[PDB]
Design a protein around this ligand. Sequence first.
Ligand SMILES: O=c1ccn([C@@H]2O[C@H](COP(=O)(O)OP(=O)(O)O[C@H]3O[C@H](CO)[C@@H](O)[C@H](O)[C@H]3O)[C@@H](O)[C@H]2O)c(=O)[nH]1
Ligand SMILES: [Mg+2]
Lengths: 289, 286
Amino acid sequence: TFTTAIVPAAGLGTRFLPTTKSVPKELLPVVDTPAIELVADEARQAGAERLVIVTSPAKQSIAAYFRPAPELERSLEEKGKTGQLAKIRRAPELLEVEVAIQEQALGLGHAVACAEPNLGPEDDVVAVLLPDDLVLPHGILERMAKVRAEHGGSVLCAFDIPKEEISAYGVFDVSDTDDADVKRVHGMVEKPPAEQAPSTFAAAGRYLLDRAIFDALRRIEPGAELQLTDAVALLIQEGHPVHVVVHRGDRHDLGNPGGFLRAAVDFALQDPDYGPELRAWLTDRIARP
Amino acid sequence: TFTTAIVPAAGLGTRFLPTTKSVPKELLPVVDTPAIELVADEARQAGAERLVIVTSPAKQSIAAYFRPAPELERSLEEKGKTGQLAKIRRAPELLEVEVAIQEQALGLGHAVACAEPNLGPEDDVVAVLLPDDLVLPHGILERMAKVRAEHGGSVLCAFDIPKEEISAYGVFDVSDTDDADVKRVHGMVEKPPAEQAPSTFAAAGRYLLDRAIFDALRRIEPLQLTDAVALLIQEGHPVHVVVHRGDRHDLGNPGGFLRAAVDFALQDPDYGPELRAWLTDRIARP
Ligand SMILES: O=c1ccn([C@@H]2O[C@H](COP(=O)(O)OP(=O)(O)O[C@H]3O[C@H](CO)[C@@H](O)[C@H](O)[C@H]3O)[C@@H](O)[C@H]2O)c(=O)[nH]1
Ligand SMILES: [Mg+2]
């Protein structure tokens, strides 16, 4: 049912300095393809027709990536680079792309709130994809849509992480449903020590939010910032159904250079253009300092 | 010695499409640091005072990378990110940076030619660094400068590559000098089969070019830099090569780029041990 997916992209990417002084984090390549394209594609495959990218005035450049490049397409076609030509055609052809300008990076809730002018009356629910999380294979938003179909309200996403490894995450307080991968959300605890974690279900950056989230974001106490978790807790307090889908597949974390490199190596090893030679090189390389 | 280094950065990097549709190839990070900073640092360490980046109009944002970012700096200082603050201050403090515009990508020789208006009377010799080649450790240009001081003329750089591995490269035709790592260049053969390779010396992307190169570039038939060098040798200009014995990386395609990033990350304690452990498991399965 959702048609509009929101991608919050207004943070600098401090962890990727000095590169992110000049390059938007969301345009950095995983092998050859930027994360913004990877999340755009995932959104489209889940039925999004429209993408609202929230960013700063300085990173408006992310928009151009979704514009055609006619001269480049011609030059590739003339060199017989049909595979490269298909690669560059992919992102502009995925969906309709708009930008919402968040003047100052006041956090995720504020970013989602800044997308509301880009919504129309048909947007009763919106998908939100954080571009630092890659959730593999495609399809978590379709699982979350089934939960919305059944229960109404809003739907979150979790990874299943042992309590001794979960303390970097927000962690859901949950109850069971009839589906082992679907829980009712009662609340969330930020970065609990292992022995205080309410579950093994760590908050992942995929959301299906009912339009009620925007009214909730206007009614929560602003910070020093609008905390999306506070708006979700307000909905829960007011009886809005909130459930979570537990992702069982793989995932990558592009929020720091180390997790980014893991993603790129994992993908390159599966690509015949690179994999065999990379694997042979790695085998030798890891045996020395 | 030379004071001006030229970095030809006007080609797209078609092996990194679709990313390089929007992002200059030379700003792609090796772990966390763009290649253009790595080659600027190398140039500075060899005594460059000035960097002339040849780029297209869509890639002029390479320039802004070398400008101070006061508000970002102020913000990092207020957050006590001393290390990230140092990292952002590094590139702007290395040297004076100018941009020359190559309207179209007519090749390397043409990229070099387009830097000539940025040169002055002191520029008798210019360094050229190709930003897809990392030559490690720093110092090849200083070795090349010693050769220029002894012999005059121009100086090239070679990797010592076995004949059965050398066919992807241009391969110098050479004669000995009194230094094992310095050869006189008689010519170059493009991509020879192993049995036709005139040496084990493959051309690397580092150059110390006498100002005579510009006149050669004006007189070669349409431009390959190697043709302008060949014209110089024909006209009696001394050309030598220094053989690099050390390490190198190739950022020309994603595979070589990942080798560089993994190599550097394994040596950095922020990433190294966990990445090593992850790689150990990962390479044991498809
Ligand atoms: O019109 C152009 C074309 C290329 N370049 C730049 O020139 C550099 C080198 O171009 P590339 O296509 O990567 O050259 P190669 O095919 O790798 O070959 C060159 O670089 C090798 C070292 O890497 C040498 O062995 C070769 O003799 C030399 O021609 C790159 O940064 C390009 O951006 C420009 O600035 N403008
Ligand atoms: Mg090259």
